[PDB]
DNA sequence: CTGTTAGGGTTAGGGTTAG
DNA sequence: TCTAACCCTAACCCTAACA
């Protein structure tokens, strides 16, 4: 975990939250869908997405999981 | 004041460890803390809870140090 | 028997607060 | 002002409860 830390861009979070309200438990395929969705919003024309910037299904997973946890905790 | 303040000697000690490893575990942090206290400890005087060094404080400092460094890096870039 | 993952933890980067 | 303590949460580990 000592590597530089990834940041979710405001535009990705929108897609995320959109998909999150619909359903908070995306399956693998769904996560891939959301991943491509997010990438499509951030990729700059004419440039490939760096491996550090590209959203993967796993990032999406962890995001959902973490959010669920934060909510459950923030409900006392 | 009424907030914890790092004594120079303590900082020196901690820095000596920071240059070797920047992520000391609990046990190591105990060692470091005890080292610090030993130095700032005066005879026949119990160190007040505030000025007393603990593994948690060491932890906080190490983290803050790493972060300060990462800032200093971006400043020069 | 093989394979997934919820949700209980922890570690640590980038930033903000509080005294 | 100065910075120790804290906040948030990305990214992982672990085991029970499944399919
Ligand atoms: Cl931290």
Q: How far apart are CA B59 and CA B10, in angstroms?
A: 13
The residue extents of the domains of chain A are 8-76
Give the resolution to one decimal, in Å: 2.9
Q: Token digits for A25?
A: 């438990």
Return the residues preceding each gap in chain A, C–N over 2.5 A, or none.
Answer: none
Q: Token digits for B17?
A: 């460890």
Residue A34: closest CA among A71, A62, A70: A62
**Domain B6-77, classified CATH 3.40.50.970, yes or no:** no
SS3 string, chain A, reads: CCCCCCCCCHHHHHHHHHHHHHCCCCCHHHHHHHHHHHHHHHCCCCCCCCCCCCCCHHHHHHHHHHHHHHHHHHCC
Q: How far is CA B8 from the centre of its chain?
A: 10
Residue nearest to nucleotide C8 (CA to C1'): A69
- Which protein residues have Cβ within 7 A of any strand C atom? A 1-5, 7, 25, 27-28, 61, 64-65, 68-69, 72; B 2-3, 23, 63-64, 66-67, 70-71
Taking the CA of residue A19 and the C1' sugar atom of nucleotide D18, their distance in angstroms comes to: 25
Residue A20: closest CA among A1, A3, A6, A37: A37
What is the residue whose two structure tokens read 């200093």? B72
Under CATH, to which class is A8-76 assigned? mainly alpha
- Which protein residues have Cβ within 7 A of any strand D atom? A 1, 5-8, 58-59, 62-63, 65-67, 70; B 3-6, 56-57, 60-61, 63-64
What was the structure determination method? Answer: X-ray
Q: Which nucleotide comes closest to B2 if you measure CA to C1'?
A: C19
Residue B31: closest CA among B20, B44, B42, B46: B20
């Amino acid at each position: 975990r000592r590597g530089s830390r990834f940041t979710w861009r405001k535009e990705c979070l929108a897609v995320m939250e959109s998909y999150f309200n619909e359903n908070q438990y995306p399956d693998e395929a769904k996560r891939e869908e959301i991943a491509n969705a997010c990438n499509a919003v951030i990729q700059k024309p004419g440039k490939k997405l760096s491996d550090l910037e590209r959203v993967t299904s796993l990032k999406v997973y962890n995001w959902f999981a973490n959010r669920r946890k934060e909510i459950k905790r923030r409900a006392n």
